[PDB]
Amino acid sequence: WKDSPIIEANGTLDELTSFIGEAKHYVDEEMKGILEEIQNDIYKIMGEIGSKGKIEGISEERIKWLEGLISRYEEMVNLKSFVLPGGTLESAKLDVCRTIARRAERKVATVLREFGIGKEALVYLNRLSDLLFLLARVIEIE
């Protein structure tokens, strides 16, 4: 039963990358590239969690990468306080991914809590939902 945090976390991360895998077919080339890099990061996070630390996880640089994109897109979005999900068919895909990332953050927080692993992964997922939110808004603007 002690592995539940591990199994639940990876199951949710798997759901996350699979939904991102679907969403990437609804965005432009640049955004698809960003989303595939994120799938790469999730792959690394799952490796660490699934191996209970035996396999290296993500770098701190991956967190800064997200933050850089967040700063960039934040500049393009005016209204961010009162918006309902899915302004467009395409942005709806990103909002769905956004909600899964938030659920993944929670599952990973638990893993860190009981195994001390996923420290960088937790912060990465926190920022990931922020970025997915902005990407959805940008798609609606563009």
Next chain:
Amino acid sequence: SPIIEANGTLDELTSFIGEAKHYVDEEMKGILEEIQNDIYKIMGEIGSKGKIEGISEERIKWLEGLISRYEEMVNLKSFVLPGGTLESAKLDVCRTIARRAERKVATVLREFGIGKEALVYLNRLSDLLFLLARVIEI
């Protein structure tokens, strides 16, 4: 914990509805958008732990009105496999997430005493989503 899980699931619900609304007809799209508005109201109350006002009884009556309307259009409801059509499948997905949201809010109500109306709304919402899906297939 219950508060976080509930709003996370409600967020999931409105997001999936936000996706499904682009596959239904004009009338249903409007209905789904109003539902997103209601979910927003529900998330406000749960997320503020009661400080912010939630949905009104009128919203529940609104769903019930729609349920009554679509009920008279559906003959077969007992034995149906989800997704007869792409659009109805989208709604069936929303229906299952709504049912999950109902359970999460149920916990918030028992542990925080908030969300009584929201619980009823979500109960009726899944009934409506079921009917909308069957109507589309009809």
Next chain:
Amino acid sequence: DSPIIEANGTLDELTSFIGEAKHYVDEEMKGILEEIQNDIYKIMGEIGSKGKIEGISEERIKWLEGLISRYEEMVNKSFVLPGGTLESAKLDVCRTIARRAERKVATVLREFGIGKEALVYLNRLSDLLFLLARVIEIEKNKL
């Protein structure tokens, strides 16, 4: 009854996602997915009735294993990112939901003693969905 309620809710989510995904695959795969929906319907009946209603037969599991063996000859599985194509992405999504369902049913078997065959079916179902996703990508690459 939470395990029962939780399991059927997730199974309902599973067949609903499969019902959506079936509109994206070819005729042969669509038929396979609809048979899977039928199997999930049977699993839900057993769980929802706490055993009163008969569940799936061992033959259904054998059915999945047969399809798994088949596709195992076409897929050579590691180091692949989900959703190579929109179609395969839909299947990958179903695969993850199936894995969640498996866990929910495991709890039911544990606490109620029902769903033994269902647990194995769900375990194997995710393996099949994974192969179906890979096959779609492989066939697309060839062209």
